[PDB]
Design a binder for this molecule. Structure first.
Ligand code: NA
Ligand code: NA
Ligand code: NA
Ligand code: NA
Ligand code: ZN
Ligand code: ZN
Ligand code: ZN
Ligand code: ZN
Lengths: 345, 345, 345, 345
């Protein structure tokens, strides 16, 4: 089923308590949603499906190119599908910067507020505010009012401090020192938003994260930044030094070393975003299909091709199954496999 | 917008009166739905999006494989998208034989009946009963009760007399004399169902039709069968000899000669089904993408590929645009281009 | 065996007498030579293997790029191979313009003169002088002295009047009226060189010929130009009006209509050049090989490929066999199949 | 130039004295010969071109399939080409087992004996007798008489003790303990043939060698076997313990670790055979060419392709250049680069 807000909060609490995390898989289509949910199910795991601004625009089609339309359409599709799987599936929106709030997160929030006002549940269970490109104080000012709106709609807010390196859509962030979150940013976050009691939130605190897949080991993660952020917050809050007040989000998950994932889990990461690796998994058998069936997918030497192999289902089923396998791998990497809160086992 | 039942009836009436038809494009996904609707819009045309049994199964994902789930999920997706286009889009289900009625058309009918009972409109605007594999009397007995249910849910029923040749999913129909509908079958149809006054229906009367794309000219259509069927019916009904009591459906549209389409339009074809040609149009740029970007979509010689080209959106946008072009061609072949009943022009 | 000058003259005499012609296949390598000779043998036919200036440069390798070296190396290779086939194989050099005479045809002539002086036979059995880019009088002045040298070395000279359209190497000739040979050019040729008694020669008189392969029918051949050239010459020589004093060469053979070849044969064509079509035949199975074995010819996803399919012999044997089939087709198109003067049958 | 027997002996003496070796590159064609020689030249190095039984059969063409014909044809081609390069190129034949002696090495020896009898030099400068599949005593009995014939024709004999693992043509040798040469085999070799004074020879003593390319490190070489073989022989001959009486040949060179090559050079390897790696280098840009030019090398959607890219020279020039680069790498790996005995520098 789709995660209710209550089940989603239980999911994250269980993950936190037991030092595991859920994959948050970027999807762009019916096929990619289907692949993600089947991956969760095959792994006996709960999970999160997320739409980026570009993914939502793509989902709306070339004749529309509207983020709200694409996200709503894909969300409605997902609600129907997820009802037929035993595992819990949460819907999320990825990086939304300041100039897209009015055309993505805010109208989506308003849609969910309306549903809640009628006694229903929100369409999405979490939304990301990415204010990493503006100064920390402005980031958190926007975060505070968005958190009030989100909590009122039974929605968890994800926020970001520090910058994720690499290319996300047309835009590149330089890989530098800004990829490492400062102690003061950790402190200001707690001051501004508390530790859950003013609305539940997730913190994408960056520790060297880079979107994309580079040669293994080229991206230099420093998970210790997270351990120190937890210590900083526990001190502010008057908690024991081993308390973990933050629920962390691991961006740029694809291409990470297994040891880096394992370490991050020890410091309170409850969500790891995966996009690039599942994109490769989806595309890889499509490529193979076109090459091995080149004379069926192309009308060559006066022949008319072979429908059996140019039927989009023929290669897209292969794409789906391959992406699902990669999602199973993510569930085993993050230790959420076999832990679905439905215990359908 | 999605066609209301009243707008759909107006569409078909206009097409009939003016000797044009709408394309009915088989879709299987968010991308193919988006491509079809954009094609209609680019052509300034209304149109029909249809899901086959296999298309619906595919739409539900490999972990579900349920026709009702896939059709409902894709339908809900389509309702969101179609609201953002000026043209009218009707939703339809394709070939449903006797052994799949209880797991496809009937439960879908029941869903729409429920919506109508609450003062709403049906989820789908038409459904196909394909009883061509059973004797004509059984075919029409089932048709009569389905027509009552359909009319009660504000849904048009499509039925089939005669067999369409070729392969549709795993199953092949032999290309023979059964592809040509008999006069008695035309007569029994009118006796059983009337001419609209017991429920609105479309008639897929076969005249040599074959699913798929063979070398141009290999498939031998006999559109005169349709002209004679109209004459047969007008005689039964006591109408002038030039009356056209049937609304005909042209199956196996892909690969047809332009002259064959033109002739069929003169005898009351109001709907032509297209699947194979739009499948080729969708796949063709995907094939080209994989070949020209072979070293980006594959991790070769120890390199890690190129995300920009293995991102599924990169080739699927090309697929969408190419399929939309083929749909524009169908609208111009069927003379519905520039005739949308929204007159947004 | 390699055609001796006496056997080559007999070949051409037989072809002329019986209204058939030999294919002259452009080759560039051991594999293409092997493919051509096997094609001749499979067709029970004699034939001609020819090297263009660019083909000879290619044959010499990227470290040498010397036309004489490449032609000699490929010729020596061919002498060894041809000895093992029952059919007669003549060696020829293709288009040599004025600025390449001193670095191609002349030094090759000198090599053969040396062999003949020692009591041997020439290395090549014919050479082409292409003076179509200079005025007719200069063309024939050069032709006359080259003919003396060639005859002294037991070599037949091919000359060209009129221009062949299209691209031959880096250089394009415009497709225009210059592609059609003038009566005066026919007359000047006979005046300058006679009709065999001052040295045996072949005449590439152009009649709309274009190098390359365009859509069937786009190239407009006028074989009547040849019939009139024969009439013009028979008049000058005081022969009956149905005499055929010229041995014609049909350039741009690839992509020609079968009816065009048949007509040209009636007017004394004894040699038709084929390059573009045999290039496509050679390459086509190589393309197929790479696509169907994509994961064997490329080291993908950390694997090391599959030697069985990246071994150049695996696809080059397929290339050879396919090119040989196209050469068999040329022998059947030109009616030389089953007519080898060895009568090994 | 082609290496005279005197220059070839000088080459090997220089390599031995200075602890370097020459690559022996398997070739199958004009293009592969050209690529190999250009590689030697680019590296300022002498080198060896070798034809296997299968390579020679391939070189003779599908209509002939005769090892002697193919080897002679390719050798004659090579003599013309090599004259135009400043470096010395030696011609060799690879693995010839007992059942192919009468149809490969023996007739080739007879051809060279004839040339020498007329005051000329041999066609090939070395030939390989591979008797590893028969007992050591039979191997060396055949070796002794072949050595007499070879020396009389100014030809060096290569022999093999121990088995090379892997697939060489249709035949596979199991990767086991037989891949490691025994001390007694080293001793019997010296007893039978001496140390050069009864005819010059090269010794392919196996030390774990495997034909082909497996994942780096999977093939376990033991170069110490060679050091001990040298010690064994120096003892038999009454030489100092650091003497190197054997000239060793390193089979299965492709895919070897650089450290393994470096070690082998210290123990008297003067020749390393490379085939599989140069095959991959030749094929790799051909694959890339077909993919990136897929719509030019195939006639698609009713188009006629693009001659510029289906011309075999277009991709074979790329193949040549890539194989030459790999040969340059071999010259730098074996430390013969910059050491050509022509000192053209
Ligand atoms: Na990443
Ligand atoms: Na069709
Ligand atoms: Na041509
Ligand atoms: Na090897
Ligand atoms: Zn991210
Ligand atoms: Zn149909
Ligand atoms: Zn030509
Ligand atoms: Zn070997």
């Amino acid at each position: 089923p789709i995660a209710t807000p209550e089940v989603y909060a239980e999911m994250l609490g269980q993950a936190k308590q037991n030092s595991y995390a859920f994959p948050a898989i970027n999807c762009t289509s019916s096929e990619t949603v289907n692949a993600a949910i089947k991956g969760f199910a095959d792994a006996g795991s709960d999970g999160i499906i997320q739409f980026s601004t570009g993914g939502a625009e793509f989902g709306s089609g070339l004749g529309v190119k509207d983020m709200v339309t694409g996200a709503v359409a894909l969300a409605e599709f997902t609600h129907v599908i997820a009802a037929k799987y035993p595992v819990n599936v949460a819907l999320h929106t990825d990086h939304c910067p300041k100039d897209k709030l009015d055309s993505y997160v805010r109208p989506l929030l308003a849609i969910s507020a309306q549903r809640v006002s009628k006694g229903g549940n929100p369409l999405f269970q979490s939304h990301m505010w990415d204010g990493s490109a503006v100064p920390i104080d402005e980031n958190l000012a926007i975060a505070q009012e968005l958190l009030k709106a989100a909590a009122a709609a039974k929605i968890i807010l994800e926020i970001e401090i520090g910058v994720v390196g690499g290319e996300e859509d047309g835009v590149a962030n330089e890989i530098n020192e800004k990829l490492y979150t400062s102690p003061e940013d950790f402190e200001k976050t707690i001051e501004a938003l508390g530790a859950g009691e003013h609305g539940k939130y997730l913190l994408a605190a960056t520790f060297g994260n880079v979107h994309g897949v580079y040669k293994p080991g080229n991206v230099k993660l420093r998970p210790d930044i997270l351990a120190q952020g937890q210590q900083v917050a526990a001190a502010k809050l008057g908690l024991p030094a081993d308390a973990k007040p933050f629920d962390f989000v691991f961006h740029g998950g694809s291409g990470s070393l297994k040891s880096e994932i394992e370490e991050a889990l020890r410091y309170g990461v409850v969500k790891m975003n995966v996009d690039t690796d599942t994109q490769y998994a989806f595309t890889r058998p499509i490529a193979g299909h076109m090459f091995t069936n080149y004379d069926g997918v192309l009308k060559v030497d006066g022949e008319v091709g072979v429908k059996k192999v140019y039927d989009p289902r023929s290669y897209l089923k292969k794409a789906e199954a391959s992406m699902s396998q990669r999602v199973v791998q993510a569930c085993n990497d993050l230790h959420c496999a076999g832990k679905s809160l439905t215990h359908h086992h």
